[PDB]
Automatic annotation (TrEMBL), chain A:
Its cofactor is Mn(2+). Keywords: Cap snatching, Endonuclease, Eukaryotic host gene expression shutoff by virus, Eukaryotic host transcription shutoff by virus, Host cytoplasm, Host gene expression shutoff by virus, Host nucleus, Host-virus interaction, Hydrolase, Inhibition of host RNA polymerase II by virus, Manganese, Metal-binding, Nuclease, Phosphoprotein. The chain holds residues 196 to 716 of 726 of the full protein. One of its GO terms (molecular function) is metal ion binding. Its EC number is 3.1.-.-. GO terms for cellular component: host cell cytoplasm; host cell nucleus. Phosphorylated on serines and threonines by host kinases, including human casein kinase II. GO terms for biological process: cap snatching; DNA-templated transcription; symbiont-mediated suppression of host gene expression; symbiont-mediated suppression of host mRNA transcription via inhibition of RNA polymerase II activity; viral RNA genome replication; viral translational frameshifting. This is Polymerase acidic protein. Plays an essential role in viral RNA transcription and replication by forming the heterotrimeric polymerase complex together with PB1 and PB2 subunits. The complex transcribes viral mRNAs by using a unique mechanism called cap-snatching. It consists in the hijacking and cleavage of host capped pre-mRNAs. These short capped RNAs are then used as primers for viral mRNAs. The PB2 subunit is responsible for the binding of the 5' cap of cellular pre-mRNAs which are subsequently cleaved after 10-13 nucleotides by the PA subunit that carries the endonuclease activity. Belongs to the influenza viruses PA family. Binds 2 manganese ions per subunit. It is an enzyme of class 3 (hydrolase).
Automatic annotation (TrEMBL), chain B:
This is Polymerase basic protein 2. Plays an essential role in transcription initiation and cap-stealing mechanism, in which cellular capped pre-mRNAs are used to generate primers for viral transcription. Recognizes and binds a wide range of cap structures of target pre-RNAs which are subsequently cleaved after 10-13 nucleotides by the viral protein PA. Plays a role in the initiation of the viral genome replication and modulates the activity of the ribonucleoprotein (RNP) complex. Residues 1-64 form the Influenza RNA polymerase PB2 second domain. It comes from the Viruses. The gene is PB2. It is found in: Host mitochondrion; Virion; Host nucleus.
TrEMBL record, chain C:
CTP binds at residues 239, 307-310, 411. The keyword Nucleotide-binding applies. It comes from Influenza B virus. One of its GO terms (biological process) is symbiont-mediated suppression of host mRNA transcription via inhibition of RNA polymerase II activity. The gene is PB1. Residues 286-482 form the RdRp catalytic domain. RNA-dependent RNA polymerase which is responsible for replication and transcription of virus RNA segments. The transcription of viral mRNAs occurs by a unique mechanism called cap-snatching. 5' methylated caps of cellular mRNAs are cleaved after 10-13 nucleotides by PA. In turn, these short capped RNAs are used as primers by PB1 for transcription of viral mRNAs. During virus replication, PB1 initiates RNA synthesis and copies vRNA into complementary RNA (cRNA) which in turn serves as a template for the production of more vRNAs. Mg(2+) 2 binds at residues 304, 445. This is RNA-directed RNA polymerase catalytic subunit.
Length: 521, 86, 661
RNA sequence: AGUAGUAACAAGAGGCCUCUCUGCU
């Protein structure tokens, strides 16, 4: 017999094939004979001729006048100032510094050695309440500070915390709802479905600008020291080693790298404690190790933290972290920044001969395993910076025929230091250097880590098309648009209460004003 | 997550699976205050567990084995290294 | 002096610094709760764009079906599913008559690959909806349970080995009057106790044999699991993805193979191209289109996106496509290549988990499942959910699943839709007017170049392309598309400006310990950096920083810092002792406390082979010991093969090749 | 409370009681 394959359909699949034809046919064989036999030529023109003229793109030519500012409700002075909702303090932190020889040690031990040196802040027992949150309990929060500062300073190895009434209040014990069978839920009339709580609508606060100002500058200490690689042999390794040794030499002493390492070490120890001890409340200190320009290692203690009951089965179950952090910033200077915090005044320090007041910011806070797991990997904030740096170098290498890293950084008799536009003092422009631009890029990556949720994702993805349209207007490519109100309304539903998204909208408006003003010249 | 699982395993005291023989009898039960391996029996396979400090104990003070002719086995990467070195 | 980051764009072009508009250092958004609301929304949106079509009732399943093909033309810029049949037939006929011999060659290649492959191809994929237990499973266990339950009803095609008898078993199982299967059930067995009650009601696992009817087997065969899309960057609000069963994978594989064989010989398809070939594809396309412009004429370029793209394509249009393509083919392959559109035109969405109703004063909560969704009055849901349920109600079947005729619902035909887009791009002109269009199409993304005498004729050609794609069910997003002159565009988030190509929207992966063992993770991490540097175009200094970040994470995870460092621990004591005892210290491994030597040129070499001629004889004796008690028994997976979640590393079986409990 | 953002966690399963060591030159 002939050696042909067999695939013969049943009855049910033939009926499902018979009822799967477009409109105008009866069975499958009529449709198959229609496609095989008849000729379709010339039908697209008739179908376009009988279609309505209201189906179109309606294209409009883009001008510099059709670009209104995005998000006009952030200048509205009846909305509240957007609060500070990051996990840890960034530009307001105060590390109690204790000089060591550089040996690593347990966190509990580090805090105990840092508090015995600064023994006037540890022995403070009578508080001075400066600021209180709306729903906080200042007596319970002060008793939790005393319980942490006594449990970190005893003469054992454990940092377990007893479940007292204030630790049960602060860690939120006994607040989940009990599940019931679905028959009792259906038969009961007072069991509705909860309306969702949408995020708020806040206006621009001035503290994000000072966060961007202060985390770009150079400090005196450095907490970043990446490990080694091999020697350099091939010339690609020479070019890469030159760009590395200039980028790291510019990024090392900035405040942002100190804040990045503080976040890395804290989320590491928090994840370790949440997986190791699910049932206990454990004291977790906020610490770091830092080094000045002579090689002297310091241990910085930034605060203490209480971890709740971490029985986190799914990846989005929340554990409660209560944070007590030292600072020197007066919380009554900028009152609209701290409604989430309870501040006490716990003492004084000598920075160089003068007294600085020392405040304690206390806050109930929370996190899930995905944010703690992505917290240990905040050193990716270097990579996205460094990669971006090379995209600014190689475009300069679209001009000449050698590695222009030294030319962009120092130059020679041919080149010059490429001044960048860095910011706006008093209204006029201000030009910085390449290292200052690298630190602004690194702080932008870091604040994408710190202040990043779905609002930042949606806002970035919907304003990138607007940035490409403005690039098209700068080049005089002459862009045409089809529905600009849709692009703008897709942008402006992402600006609710993220501080970085509101400040990005403000900065976008300022830069678009500069670009319009420089178009007329 | 296998990254965090390997992290929390290396935090644990005995995460490894030491096979039997006389070599698992050469490794002690402790060393300078570091308990290298435990000493117990299992339900089905009758085994023990050990630390990674025991692996470094093997690499520091373990017995010398025979490696007269190791380079004849994995010579692909040794040709890679021979191309790299010149 | 107020620092502004956007001022970076005053001295740098925006394409060169576009990677700061990718926030890839923050957390990708996850979805706590149920994806029942998002699935109900996707069902409503699918049935909303096609409600003006023919609505009827299936005489197989009883679900309410909706057919929009050859329906009325649109009258607004709202999305449409009314694809005319003669327009798709004319687009495919022009596509065949411009590339002669293409369709017959693609059909012959697809049949001569069908007559080769075996059922293990149905394991090299993704999760699979399991009809036995009504849940997602891996592909191997889903195929295994389907085979061992087909054996009870005398369906022995899979015992032969091929794919054609297995698909014959699939299309013959739909005619069984009763289907019996192995369902794992923890049916209780009563055990005594010494307590006040004396019984311990426990759940002992076993295997029982249950059976359903023919209609229930059909509705479980046509079913489609739904969930929420986790960790998707670039959108504010979440969305649902689907997942099909195992009764459909063997046909989807052949249809995808046929459309890939068409797309490989298409000169305007940016998929499945990959690497620096993509940057060459953009540059070649712009060069070929600027090599055809009229003198004194303008060449524009539309950078575009597709709105509701996999919700408005129909499976009946795909049935007509595969009936046209496989035309000069034998009858059995013409019936084989027309079964995946049949099973996709009758698909049934499963609605997920349900809705959690709470009582705030008594502090109680419960979860209403999908069958009992309409068992409570509708004024106990919130307004968004209440309008959703009022609009869902005519399509809900009483088993908790909702009918879903139109739409592709996630995209399983990511190549046949690409063929439809290229068929739309190949028309080039309507009514002898003075323009010509061309361009690239990548599944959902597309880029359209238009050459004409001025820019008014360019806009008229763009309008004709929009109105032409309305006739195919290809909806072009008017809010996410813009149009400029040639030399500045974007395709699959590869940006093109003045010949320069900026390749991005690839998040750099977790340069950290994978978790297999020490030598395995070192080899996997260095191969990750080398593959990123070859394919993704990662720079030299970026790759050296990635080496250093991986070395820091590696030394933290396995507690194996350098011997001349001040780090302390239970392992660093013996590590510092080893550093004290060693004469030649550069031969030590990273995990023994030695230094790092990896640079850009030796990422392909194993660590042991890289350092072998530098070790002390004692250290290589203890390291490369023959009877070392840490390895155990050998197998291929413990030597070379492990996944990245696949690669093949080179691990010399020394004492850093242990394994856990 | 808090995290979070269109919907969930703020322990669960059982007979007052049980089960689910952590050092970033």
């Amino acid at each position: 017999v002939e050696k042909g394959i067999d695939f013969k359909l049943g009855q049910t699949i033939s009926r499902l094939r018979d009822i799967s034809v477009p409109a105008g046919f009866s069975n499958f064989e009529g449709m198959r004979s229609y496609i095989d036999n008849i000729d379709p030529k010339g039908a697209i023109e008739r179908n376009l001729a009988r279609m309505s003229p209201l189906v179109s793109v309606t294209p409009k030519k883009l001008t510099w006048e059709d670009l209104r500012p995005i998000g006009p409700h952030i200048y509205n002075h009846e909305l509240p100032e957007v609060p500070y909702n990051a996990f840890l303090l960034m530009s307001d932190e105060l590390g109690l510094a204790n000089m060591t020889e550089g040996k690593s040690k347990k966190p509990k031990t580090l805090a105990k050695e840092c508090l015995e040196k600064y023994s006037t802040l540890r022995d403070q027992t009578d508080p001075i309440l400066i600021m209180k949150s709306e729903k906080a309990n200042e007596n319970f929060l002060w008793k939790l500070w005393r319980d942490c500062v006594n449990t970190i300073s005893n003469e054992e190895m454990s940092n377990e915390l007893q479940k007292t009434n204030y630790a049960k209040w602060a860690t939120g014990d006994g607040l989940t709802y009990q599940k019931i069978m679905k028959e009792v839920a259906i038969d009961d009339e007072t069991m509705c479905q909860e309306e969702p709580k949408i995020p708020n609508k806040c206006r621009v606060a001035a503290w994000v600008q000072t966060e961007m100002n202060l985390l770009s500058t150079l400090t005196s200490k450095r907490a970043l020291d990446l490990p080694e690689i091999g020697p350099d042999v091939a010339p690609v390794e020479h070019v890469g080693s030159e760009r590395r040794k200039y980028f790291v030499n510019e990024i090392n002493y900035c405040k942002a790298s100190t804040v990045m390492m503080k976040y890395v070490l804290f989320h590491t120890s928090l994840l370790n404690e949440s997986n190791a001890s699910m049932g206990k409340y454990k004291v977790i200190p906020i610490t770091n190790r830092v080094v000045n320009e002579k090689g002297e290692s310091f241990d910085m203690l930034y605060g203490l933290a209480v971890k709740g009951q971490s029985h986190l089965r799914g990846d989005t179950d929340v554990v409660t972290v209560v944070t007590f952090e030292f600072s020197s910033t007066d919380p009554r200077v900028d009152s609209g920044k701290w409604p989430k915090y309870t501040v006490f005044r716990i003492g004084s320090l000598f920075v160089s001969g003068r007294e600085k007041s020392v405040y304690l910011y206390c806050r109930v806070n929370g996190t899930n395993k995905i944010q703690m797991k992505w917290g240990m990997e905040a050193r990716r904030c270097l990579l996205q910076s460094m990669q971006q740096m090379e995209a600014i170098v190689e475009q300069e290498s679209s001009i000449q025929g050698y590695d222009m890293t030294k030319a962009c950084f120092k130059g020679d008799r041919v080149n010059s230091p490429k001044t960048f536009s860095i910011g706006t003092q008093e209204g006029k422009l201000v030009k910085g250097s390449f290292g200052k631009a690298l630190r602004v890029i690194f702080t932008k990556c870091l604040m994408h880590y710190v202040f990043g949720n779905a609002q930042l994702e949606g806002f970035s993805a919907e304003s990138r098309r607007l940035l490409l349209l403005i690039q098209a207007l700068k080049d005089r490519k002459g862009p045409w648009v089809f529905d600009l109100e849709g692009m703008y309304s897709g942008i402006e539903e992402c600006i609710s209460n993220n501080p970085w998204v509101i400040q990005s909208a403000y900065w976008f408006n300022e830069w678009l004003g500069f670009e319009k003003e420089g178009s007329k010249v | 997550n296998p990254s965090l699982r390997m992290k929390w395993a290396m935090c644990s005291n005995f995460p490894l699976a030491l096979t039997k023989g006389d070599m698992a009898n050469r490794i002690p039960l402790e060393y300078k205050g570091i308990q290298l391996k435990t000493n117990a029996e299992d339900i089905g396979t009758k085994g023990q567990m050990c630390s990674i400090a025991a692996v470094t104990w093997w690499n520091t003070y373990g017995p010398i084995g025979d490696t007269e002719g190791f380079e004849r086995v994995y010579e692909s990467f040794f040709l890679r290294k021979m191309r790299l070195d010149n | 002096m107020n620092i502004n980051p956007y001022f970076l764009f005053i001295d740098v072009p925006i394409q060169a610094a576009i990677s700061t508009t990718f926030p890839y250092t923050g957390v990708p958004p996850y979805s706590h709760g149920t994806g029942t609301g998002y699935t109900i929304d996707t069902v409503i949106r699918t049935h909303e764009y096609s409600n003006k079509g023919k609505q009827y009732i299936s005489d197989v399943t009883g679900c309410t079906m909706v057919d929009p093909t050859n329906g009325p033309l649109p009258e607004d810029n709202e999305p449409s599913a009314y694809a005319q049949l003669d327009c798709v037939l004319e687009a495919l006929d022009r596509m065949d008559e411009e590339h002669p011999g293409l369709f017959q060659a693609a059909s012959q290649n697809a049949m001569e690959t069908l007559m080769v492959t075996t059922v293990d191809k149905l394991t090299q994929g993704r999760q699979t909806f399991d009809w036995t237990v009504c849940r997602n499973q891996p592909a191997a266990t889903a195929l295994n349970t389907t085979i061992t339950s087909f054996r009870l009803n005398d369906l022995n095609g899979a015992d032969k080995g091929g794919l054609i008898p297995f698909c014959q078993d699939i299309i013959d199982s739909l005619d069984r009057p009763e289907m019996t299967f192995f369902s794992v059930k923890n049916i209780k067995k009563k055990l005594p106790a010494k307590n006040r009650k004396g019984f311990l009601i426990k759940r002992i696992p076993m295997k029982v044999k249950d059976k359903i009817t023919k209609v229930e087997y059909i509705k479980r065969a046509l079913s489609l699991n739904t969930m929420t899309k986790d960790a998707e960057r670039g959108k504010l609000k979440r969305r649902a993805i689907a997942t099909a069963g195992i009764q459909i994978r063997g046909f989807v594989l052949v249809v995808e193979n046929l459309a890939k064989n068409i797309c490989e010989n298409l000169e305007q398809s940016g998929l499945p191209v990959g690497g620096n070939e993509k940057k060459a594809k953009l540059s070649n396309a712009v060069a070929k289109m600027l090599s055809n412009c009229p003198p004194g004429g303008i060449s524009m370029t539309v950078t575009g996106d597709n709105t509701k793209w996999n919700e408005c394509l129909n499976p009946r249009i795909f049935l007509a496509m595969t009936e046209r393509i496989t035309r000069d083919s034998p009858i059995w392959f013409r019936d084989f290549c027309s079964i995946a559109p049949v099973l996709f035109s009758n698909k049934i969405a499963r609605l997920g988990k349900g809705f959690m109703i709470t009582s705030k004063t008594k502090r109680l909560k419960a979860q209403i499942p999908c069958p009992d969704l309409f068992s409570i009055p509708l004024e106990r849901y919130n307004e968004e959910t209440r309008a959703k349920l009022k609009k869902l109600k005519p399509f809900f079947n009483e088993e908790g699943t909702a009918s879903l005729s139109p739409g592709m619902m996630m995209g399983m035909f990511n190549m046949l839709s690409t063929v439809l887009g290229v068929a739309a791009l190949g028309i080039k002109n309507i009514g002898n007017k003075e323009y010509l269009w061309d361009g690239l199409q990548s599944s959902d993304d597309f880029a359209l170049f238009v050459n004409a005498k001025d820019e008014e004729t360019c806009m008229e050609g763009i309008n004709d392309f929009y109105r032409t794609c309305k006739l195919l069910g290809i909806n072009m997003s008017k809010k996410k598309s813009y149009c400029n002159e040639t030399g500045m565009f974007e395709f699959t988030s590869m940006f093109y400006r003045d010949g320069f190509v900026s390749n991005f929207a690839m998040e750099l992966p977790s340069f950290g310990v994978a978790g297999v063992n020490e030598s395995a993770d070192m080899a996997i991490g260095m191969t990750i950096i080398k593959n990123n540097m070859i394919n993704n175009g990662m720079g030299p200094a970026t790759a050296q920083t990635a080496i250093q970040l991986f070395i820091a994470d590696y030394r933290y995870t396995y507690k194996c810092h350098r011997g001349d460092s001040k780090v302390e621990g239970k392992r660093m004591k013996i590590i510092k002792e080893l550093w004290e005892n060693t004469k030649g210290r550069d031969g030590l491994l990273v995990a023994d406390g030695g230094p790092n030597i990896y640079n850009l040129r030796n990422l392909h070499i194993p660590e042991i082979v890289l350092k072998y001629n530098l070790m002390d004889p004692e250290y290589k004796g203890r390291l490369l010991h023959p009877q070392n008690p840490f390895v155990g028994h050998l197998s291929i997976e413990g030597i070379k093969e492990a996944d990245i979640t696949k690669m093949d590393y080179d691990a010399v079986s020394g004492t850093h090749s242990w394994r856990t409990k």
